[PDB]
C-alpha cells in the first residue's frame, strides 16, 4: 500500500463576528494574497486587519489584493491587475460644483405684477426665492439665490444671485427664462451655466443648473422638490466598510 493525501474544501459556517474586516466567503473563492517577497497565495482566512502602513493584511501578514480605484469619485478598474489594497487616512479634497439640478414646481396661477425691482429683497417682484449651495475651487460655499418671476402663463423669468460674495450685485437682469407647454411641462430654458462667485482666490467655477422636469401646475405652492450640488467640500476618514460585493469603501 501507498497513500495519496487530499483535502476536501466544503464550506464551513458563518460565525456571528464583528471585529476588524471579518470577511467570510461562501461557496468557491479564495482571497488573493501577496507575500512581501512578491509571491501570490490563496486563502479563505477571513481575518483581516489594517496594519500601520495602511495595508490590509492577514496574520500570516500577507497583503490582501484587489482591483485599484481611480478617478474622483474613484472607480474600479476591473480590467487592471490585482493591486495591494491600501486605505489612506488622508483628506478628501474639495470638489467644485460642476453641475446642479433643481426640480421646481410652480403654481400655474401665481403672477408678480405687484413690483418690478429686484435686489434680492423686493418680495413682490417674484414668486419664489430658492437657494442652492455650491462649491468653488477651494470648496468655499456659495449662495445661489434663484428667483422665479411669473411673467405670464408658462413663462417665468429667472434671476440668479450669489449672496456669499459682494460680487453678486443686484440681480436685476433675467439670467434666463423658462417656457412651459399647456400641460405645465418645462419645454425650454433647461439649463444655464451660472457662476459661483469667488472667495480667497478660489475660482468662480460656474456650473450647469438644470431645471429638467420642472412643472407649472394648478396646485401647490412654489417649491423645490430635490436639488443637487455636484461636488464636495473637504473630508476626513471616519470609518471603514466592506460590502458583500467585496467593495471596500471609506466613509
Amino acid at each position: 500500500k501507498v497513500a495519496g493525501i487530499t483535502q476536501d474544501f466544503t464550506d464551513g459556517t458563518t460565525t456571528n463576528t464583528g471585529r476588524g474586516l471579518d470577511v467570510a466567503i461562501s461557496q468557491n473563492g479564495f482571497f488573493r494574497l501577496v507575500d512581501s517577497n512578491g509571491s501570490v497565495f490563496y486563502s479563505r482566512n477571513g481575518q483581516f486587519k489594517l496594519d500601520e502602513n495602511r495595508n490590509l493584511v492577514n496574520m500570516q501578514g500577507m497583503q490582501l489584493t484587489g482591483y485599484p480605484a481611480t478617478g474622483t469619485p474613484p472607480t474600479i478598474q476591473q480590467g487592471a491587475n490585482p493591486a495591494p489594497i491600501t486605505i489612506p487616512n488622508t483628506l478628501m479634497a474639495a470638489k467644485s460644483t460642476t453641475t446642479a439640478s433643481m426640480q421646481i414646481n410652480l403654481n400655474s396661477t401665481d403672477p408678480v405684477p405687484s413690483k418690478t425691482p429686484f435686489s434680492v429683497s423686493d418680495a413682490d417682484s417674484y414668486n419664489k426665492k430658492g437657494t442652492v449651495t455650491v462649491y468653488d475651487s477651494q470648496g468655499n460655499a456659495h449662495d445661489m439665490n434663484v428667483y422665479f418671476v411669473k411673467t405670464k402663463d408658462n413663462e417665468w423669468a429667472v434671476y440668479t444671485h450669489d449672496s456669499s460674495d459682494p460680487a453678486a450685485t443686484a440681480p436685476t437682469t433675467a439670467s434666463t427664462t423658462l417656457k412651459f407647454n399647456e400641460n405645465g411641462i418645462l419645454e425650454s430654458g433647461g439649463t444655464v451655466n451660472i457662476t459661483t462667485g469667488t472667495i480667497n482666490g478660489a475660482t468662480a467655477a460656474t456650473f450647469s443648473l438644470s431645471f429638467l422636469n420642472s412643472m407649472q401646475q394648478n396646485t401647490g405652492a412654489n417649491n423645490i422638490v430635490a436639488t443637487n450640488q455636484n461636488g464636495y467640500k473637504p473630508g476626513d476618514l471616519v470609518s471603514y466598510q466592506i460590502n458583500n460585493d467585496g467593495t471596500v469603501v471609506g466613509n
Partner: protein
Amino acid sequence: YSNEQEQVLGQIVLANFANNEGLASQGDNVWAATQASGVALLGTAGSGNF
C-alpha cells in the same frame, strides 16, 4: 471659582492609532504603542475621529 467664573486648566488629549488592534498589552489596562499600531495621532473629543 469664587471669582465668579470658569477658567481653562487644560485639554485632555486623545490618541488614535492606525491600528488599535496591534497595541501591546501592559499593566492594569495600559497599552504600549507599537509599530503594528503605528504612531498615535493626537486630537480632542469631538474633533476628527476622536
